[PDB]
Ligand binder design. Structure first.
Ligand code: FAD
Lengths: 133, 6, 665, 5
């Protein structure tokens, strides 16, 4: 029913190997040209990737900022409110970003803010101002 | 024949 | 076993009637199931009786004597069965003490060409049936392709060497009749490379496994994919092996291709990530400056200035996040690439050293069949395998020649008589033969029937060495041409000191190239006297026949010096080099199933020839020309026993034809 | 001549 385990004999390969006298030795050298091409083909792009790694030199060490070490608060200061109004102007409905700018508010509180002061901060107008970009 | 195989 | 074992030993199904039995007992096998079982017992018992004591004739009277009821109640059956068994050489064959001395007068004249094993076996039988039998041998000795070098204490076979298992073998009987010292062959065969260094059990076992694997693979091609014809030409085992080897070398590369093909893809995946990582470090470098500058605006500040610091802060920490997550993916792709380059798949299928060792294994198979694998029928080369005997193989320690010489005794044999023409017609046969010593001097032999035991290679000769008048019908001559007749030679090296491993029966030698893989590839340590025996198989077989003995013996010593030491190997006292292909009375070693031939041709070889009528319109006559030999037997070709059984077979057929069958009436 | 049997 099946060939010995590890022996690979497809119906199609037999026909391809026997097509003529030395058809098979052409198929075998073809794969040798293939492997030689694919083999150095690697070094060319191994070296490219190494060159790209070299422009990345140093990482992002002297760019990481002081930590956002501050405890969350339920109370809205006037300052904090204003920070949010501007964050709708810059970010739209990205409530996580707005929350991170303020720093001491949870995403839910920012959404809560958005509904109550929707009227008094004309936030609908602030959103569509952001949308125009 | 086969039977001759060493 | 017991009675059932007797049938087995006689190559017969114990619980069933054979096709030849149906032919002779068409009343019983068409009869009720009870009768058949009675028949089968009588048959099986009678075989047992003869087998238990093969050295004396087993008569009908002696058989009936030792039968119990109800089996002895039908004495016509017991007689019929016994006669059948005796006729077809299942009992009372070989060399036995005759109870009733040979019939007073002789019926029918039979000329047998050749006193090889088949020839003798038919001669001993036809004489047992009271016929007038004369054998015409071209050689100055009996045995034909069974030939033992005897000189002083040195004894070595140039022909048949091995008994391929006693289980079912008719030679098992003969070995109890004649003095045969049968020694078991220890199948442990160490291999040695070109330089003379042994092959490590690591390599040995892995290559041998691959050999057997490659063979099953060819069967898959033959049977499962029907790869049997290619460009009108029939596929040989040699070709199919190459196909399968190439398909394995192909796969080795395809696995390498798709592995590096997988590196380049991971190599790319990194590049795309790196470009993204560069462009992000660019924007982080920029966004840091914007943050830095906005931080310089010292407090107190208005809320839009405040927002700017806080906003640039968020925007920057978010981009730092991304870069750390992209550096995470960099590390993973980086080690994944060190994973793939660390361990590729298989480098090669078979190294130079691997292939050479595999080539030895082919040399073995080329020897087994006495022919380059490029000639063997892929489908049928092994057709005779199912009939292999049980038990371990043995060699004749005193030389196989004891068997022909034994059988020869008591027979009219004309040595040194080369049959030049066989003439068969309605009313009889004449055999035109010359004396081998003075060739222009002639003999004429008149007979009722001729048994031809001419080696296939002789029947193959062009121009014909023997001429058939009238010419053999095209069906017979096509059989002769389709069928393969191989070649295999032996170098006998007679020393007077054992420098080899005495507990080892045989050791191999690995040739440098495929071209010469069967050149002195195998050595036999078999005999009492310190004699080594070297095999020349495959293509090397034929080519070495053109090379002088000294050069051949030289190569043998050189090889042996490589294994055993430059000074451990003395000059042999006596050497012999066989050249079977060049030998006019064999023209090769033994038959094989060639590509384009099949197992059926072997049957065509056995099929007898009935001449045409003398007067036009006269009745179709009796069969005149008969064929026995190793090449005339589908189930045991190329073997001593095979030959033996053909002789036994033909004698029966001829006797039936000329003395009538009593056992069928 | 020869020593074959
Ligand atoms: C090297 C070698 C090793 C072998 N090893 C084994 C083995 O291990 N086991 C095994 O079972 N078998 C083996 N065999 C095969 C076995 O020996 C033969 O199959 C068997 O002997 C064949 O008997 P035969 O009667 O059919 O042919 P042969 O024995 O050849 O009989 C034919 C006879 O006819 C004679 N003859 C030929 N032409 C003419 C003519 N024109 N006129 C008159 N007479 C003629 C010949 O001289 C010969 O004696 C081996 C054969 C060889 C060559």
């Amino acid at each position: 029913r099946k060939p010995p385990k590890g022996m690979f004999l497809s119906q199609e390969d037999v026909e391809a190997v026997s097509a003529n006298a030395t058809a098979a030795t052409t198929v075998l050298r073809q794969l040798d040209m293939e492997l030689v091409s694919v083999k150095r083909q690697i070094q060319n792009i191994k070296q490219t990737n190494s060159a790209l790694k070299e422009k990345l030199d140093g990482g992002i060490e002297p760019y990481r900022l002081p930590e956002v070490i501050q405890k969350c608060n339920a109370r809205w200061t006037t300052e904090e409110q204003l920070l949010a109004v501007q964050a709708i102007r810059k970010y739209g409905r990205d409530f996580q970003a707005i929350s991170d700018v303020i720093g001491n508010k949870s995403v839910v509180q920012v959404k809560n803010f958005f509904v109550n002061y929707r009227r008094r901060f004309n936030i609908d107008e602030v959103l569509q101002e952001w949308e125009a970009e | 024949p086969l039977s001759f195989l060493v | 076993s017991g009675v059932e074992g007797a049938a087995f030993q006689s190559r017969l199904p114990h619980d069933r009637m054979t096709s030849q039995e149906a032919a002779c007992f068409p009343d019983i096998i068409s009869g009720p199931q009870q009768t058949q079982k009675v028949f089968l017992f009588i048959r099986n018992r009678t075989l047992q009786l003869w087998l238990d004591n093969p050295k004396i004739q087993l008569t009908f009277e002696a058989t009936l004597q030792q039968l119990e009821a109800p089996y002895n109640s039908d004495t016509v059956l017991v007689h019929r069965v016994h006669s059948y068994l005796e006729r077809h050489g299942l009992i009372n064959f070989g060399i036995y003490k005759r109870i009733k001395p040979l019939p007073t007068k002789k019926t029918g004249k039979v000329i047998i060409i050749g006193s090889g094993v088949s020839g003798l076996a038919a001669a001993r039988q036809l004489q047992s049936f009271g016929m007038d039998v004369t054998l015409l041998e071209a050689r100055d000795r009996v045995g034909g392709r069974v030939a033992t070098f005897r000189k002083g204490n040195y004894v070595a076979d140039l022909g048949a060497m091995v008994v391929t298992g006693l289980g079912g073998n008719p030679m098992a009987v003969v070995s109890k009749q004649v003095n045969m010292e049968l020694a078991k062959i220890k199948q442990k065969c160490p291999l040695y490379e070109a330089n003379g260094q042994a092959v490590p059990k690591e390599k040995d076992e892995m290559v041998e496994q691959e050999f057997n694997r490659l063979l099953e693979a060819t069967s898959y091609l033959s049977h499962q994919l029907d790869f049997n014809v290619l460009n009108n030409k029939p596929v040989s085992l040699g070709q199919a092996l190459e196909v399968v080897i190439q398909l394995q070398e192909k796969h080795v590369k395809d696995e390498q291709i798709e592995h590096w093909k997988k590196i380049v893809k991971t190599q790319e995946e990194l590049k795309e990530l790196l470009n993204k990582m560069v462009n992000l470090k660019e924007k982080i470098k920029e966004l840091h400056q914007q943050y830095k500058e906005a931080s310089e605006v010292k407090p107190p500040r208005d809320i839009t200035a405040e927002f700017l610091v806080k906003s640039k802060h968020r925007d920057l920490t978010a981009l730092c996040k991304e870069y750390d997550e992209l550096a995470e993916t960099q590390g993973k792709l980086e080690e994944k690439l060190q994973e793939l380059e660390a361990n590729p798949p298989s480098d090669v299928y078979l190294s130079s050293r691997d292939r050479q060792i595999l080539d030895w294994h082919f040399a073995n198979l080329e020897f087994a069949n006495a022919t380059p694998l490029s000639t063997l029928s892929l489908k049928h080369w092994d057709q005779d395998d199912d009939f292999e005997f049980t038990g371990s193989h043995l060699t004749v320690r005193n030389g196989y020649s004891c068997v022909p010489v034994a059988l020869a005794e008591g027979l009219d044999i004309k040595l040194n008589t080369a049959v030049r023409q066989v003439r068969y017609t309605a009313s009889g046969c004449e055999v035109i033969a010359v004396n081998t010593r003075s060739t222009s001097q002639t003999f004429i032999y008149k007979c009722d029937a001729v048994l031809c035991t001419l080696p296939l290679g002789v029947l193959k000769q062009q121009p014909p060495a023997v001429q058939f008048v009238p010419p053999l019908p095209e069906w017979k001559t096509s059989a002769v041409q389709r069928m393969g007749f191989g070649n295999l030679n032996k170098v006998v090296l007679c020393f007077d000191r054992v420098f080899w491993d005495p507990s080892v029966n045989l050791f191999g030698h690995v040739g440098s190239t495929t071209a010469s893989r069967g050149e002195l590839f195998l050595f036999w340590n078999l005999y009492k006297a310190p004699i080594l025996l070297a095999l020349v198989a495959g293509e090397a077989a034929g080519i070495m026949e053109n090379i002088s003995d000294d050069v051949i013996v030289g190569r043998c010593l050189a090889i042996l010096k490589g294994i055993f030491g430059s000074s451990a190997v003395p000059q042999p006292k006596e050497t012999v080099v066989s050249r079977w292909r060049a030998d006019p009375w064999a023209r090769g070693s033994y038959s094989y199933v060639a590509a384009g031939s099949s197992g059926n041709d072997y049957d065509l070889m056995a099929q007898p020839i009935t001449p045409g009528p003398s007067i036009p319109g006269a009745p179709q006559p009796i069969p005149r020309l008969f064929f026995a030999g190793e090449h005339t037997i589908r189930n045991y070709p190329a073997t001593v026993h095979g030959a033996l059984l053909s002789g036994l077979r033909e004698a029966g057929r001829i006797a039936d034809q000329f003395l009538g069958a009593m056992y069928t009436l």
